[PDB]
Design an enzyme around this catalytic site. Structure first.
Site, PDB file in Angstrom:
ATOM      1  CG  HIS A  12      -0.660   0.107   2.503  1.00 22.31           C
ATOM      2  ND1 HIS A  12      -0.091   1.261   3.028  1.00 22.31           N
ATOM      3  CD2 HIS A  12      -0.775  -0.759   3.537  1.00 22.31           C
ATOM      4  CE1 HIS A  12       0.150   1.088   4.308  1.00 22.31           C
ATOM      5  NE2 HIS A  12      -0.251  -0.149   4.645  1.00 22.31           N
TER       6      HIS A  12
ATOM      7  N   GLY B 109       2.631   5.972  10.533  1.00 21.56           N
ATOM      8  CA  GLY B 109       4.011   5.822  10.025  1.00 21.56           C
ATOM      9  C   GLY B 109       4.683   4.531  10.482  1.00 21.56           C
TER      10      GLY B 109
ATOM     11  CB  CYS C 260       2.581   0.889   7.634  1.00 23.66           C
ATOM     12  SG  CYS C 260       0.904   1.261   8.202  1.00 23.66           S
TER      13      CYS C 260
HETATM   14  C1  LIG Z   1      -0.424   2.146  10.996  1.00 20.44           C
HETATM   15  C2  LIG Z   1      -1.336   2.049  12.181  1.00 20.44           C
HETATM   16  O1  LIG Z   1      -1.423   1.023  12.818  1.00 20.44           O
HETATM   17  C3  LIG Z   1      -2.120   3.207  12.561  1.00 20.44           C
HETATM   18  C4  LIG Z   1      -1.947   3.705  13.832  1.00 20.44           C
HETATM   19  C5  LIG Z   1      -2.663   4.804  14.251  1.00 20.44           C
HETATM   20  C6  LIG Z   1      -3.571   5.420  13.396  1.00 20.44           C
HETATM   21  C7  LIG Z   1      -3.753   4.918  12.107  1.00 20.44           C
HETATM   22  C8  LIG Z   1      -3.028   3.795  11.686  1.00 20.44           C
HETATM   23  C9  LIG Z   1      -3.278   3.306  10.262  1.00 20.44           C
HETATM   24  O2  LIG Z   1      -3.967   2.283  10.125  1.00 20.44           O
HETATM   25  O3  LIG Z   1      -2.759   4.013   9.377  1.00 20.44           O
END
Ligand code: A1BVZ
Ligand code: CL
Ligand code: NA
EC number: 3.4.19.12
Lengths: 301, 305
Positions: free
Chosen positions: A41, A143, A145
């Site tokens: 993604h 961030g 991910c």
């Molecule tokens: C990446 C993640 O786990 C996350 C954490 C907090 C808010 C949003 C996300 C999202 O899924 O992008």
């Protein structure tokens, strides 16, 4: 003695963490030999969130659209392919800090360490379990991910999780390192919610065995139970069914403490009925389900 | 979102751990520049530990009485000295993996990461608080002596703890890296016990702020209170008194949530009196006191190393 939620030393994983950028999207990648692994993604824009066609978005990219940074060094991308939900960037440099590693897909109830990372830099390390509903109860901000989960049994690093997204209930979903999601989830922003969660019964018993090894006996009783009667009671508290496999796995802890697995099941039935009456076990006022039988034996005498 | 007990990434410290043997005793050393630090009690037999004379035992030893192994490589010991309860072994070679580091002494209530090691091999990492009674609630087996505790501030490792012993109650005692004990303990096989412990008030408040930030809010209320009023409640429940310094340290979390500390103390006051009414906060049935205000802000803002 003592008993602690204990993660693996993270150094062998720290040496593998990089930043991956595509368009205006920056997340973490995992650098092993001459390949960087990251969530596919990364190649999505604003409208590509709901129904991305990954094969179509990827074919429109060249190697030079992917900016990869190991600390200050810019790695040069020479190759790119997709395997399931994971993007694989070939680079000209093999990582000199690459450890003995393997990829494994774990089952619900397994535990691992998570190295939470931001912009390719490690922030912290903690322990998680794969919940029976195929989510993890993580600590992840925007961030994070591309952050991974791992075990280090005997100097070889087994990578078992890569972080993809947070679901509406605040729990976390991701893939194995071959890009296949745990659970019925997809890398699209279409409405998704985890199944009702359950308590990992075999892990609760292992932790009761841990409490006994550490010299706590107040919760034991003179009773036993059949495996069937245990499962009929336990499921009325949203507990996972206990299988003969689970019973076999507890054999060694049974042997070390001289308490049969079905006697300990009788103790658990009573705790579920009475609660703890202002007491604690190994420092918790709840029954803990994120320690496996393997974890208990590794940490315990 | 989410909130977990989280250690600092341990890699900078894994690169400093070695094995130290003197006679029948093996344990862990910290190798920094050209010096290996370990507990002085490495030089003791079982008989010695009953009433040891460290001055006298140490002068009888020589450099070659100390086997120092960094993986599959012997280091050459070229000097030995004692600073308080820590042995310093000067070696012919500087640790090429030495990070930017300081030696630091922590206060009761402050947290740090422990890298649990055996035979000079890192085994596990976990977060601990220095208890008000100067013990830590660790997880340690035989061979863990010389395991260290640390924080990271930017790229600098601050070493604050070296493991020495387990107490009869299952809790753990050790020194700073200059060999001074935390708490009224000595490195001798003798009868020693932890003072009655107390709850770290400012940490419980920080953890209630983490709960709110992660959408756990039931325990909140319209009430407020005073330091004087709360502290008479705290004293009663074996809580540390709350200072004005503690209220200032929580400023960020009181801001970022719109709960005022004495607002939040009113919630905590009710919790100690009334209980949790069979609920949980961040998946706990206990009031958790091993997260500092800094730990909560670091984790709910994503600070990197
Ligand atoms: C990446 C993640 O786990 C996350 C954490 C907090 C808010 C949003 C996300 C999202 O899924 O992008
Ligand atoms: Cl598994
Ligand atoms: Na209030």
């Amino acid at each position: 003695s003592g008993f602690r939620k204990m993660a693996f030393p993270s150094g062998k994983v720290e040496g593998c963490m990089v930043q991956v950028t595509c368009g205006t999207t920056t997340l973490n990648g995992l650098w092993l030999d001459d390949v960087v692994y990251c969530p596919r993604h990364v190649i999505c824009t604003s409208e590509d969130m709901l129904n991305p066609n990954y094969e179509d978005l990827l074919i429109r990219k060249s190697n030079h659209n992917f900016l990869v940074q190991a600390g200050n060094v810019q790695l040069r991308v020479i190759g790119h392919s997709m395997q399931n939900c994971v993007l694989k960037l070939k680079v000209d440099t093999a990582n000199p800090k690459t450890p003995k590693y393997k990829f494994v897909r774990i089952q619900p109830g397994q535990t691992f360490s998570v190295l939470a990372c931001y912009n390719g830099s490690p922030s912290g390390v903690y322990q998680c379990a794969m919940r029976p509903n195929f989510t993890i109860k993580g600590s992840f901000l925007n961030g994070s991910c591309g952050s991974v989960g791992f075990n280090i049994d005997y100097d070889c690093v087994s990578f078992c999780y890569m972080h993809h997204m947070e679901l509406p209930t605040g729990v976390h979903a991701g893939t194995d390192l071959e890009g296949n999601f745990y659970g019925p989830f997809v890398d699209r922003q279409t409405a998704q919610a985890a199944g009702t969660d359950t308590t990992i019964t075999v892990n609760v018993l292992a932790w009761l065995y841990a409490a006994v090894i550490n010299g706590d006996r107040w919760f034991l009783n003179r009773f036993t139970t059949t495996l069937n009667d245990f499962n009929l009671v336990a499921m009325k508290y949203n507990y996972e069914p206990l299988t003969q496999d689970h019973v076999d796995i507890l054999g060694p802890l049974s042997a070390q403490t001289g308490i049969a697995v079905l006697d300990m099941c009788a103790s658990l039935k009573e705790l579920l009925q009475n609660g703890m009456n202002g007491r604690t076990i190994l420092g918790s006022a709840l029954l803990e389900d994120e320690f496996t039988p393997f974890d208990v034996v590794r940490q315990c005498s």
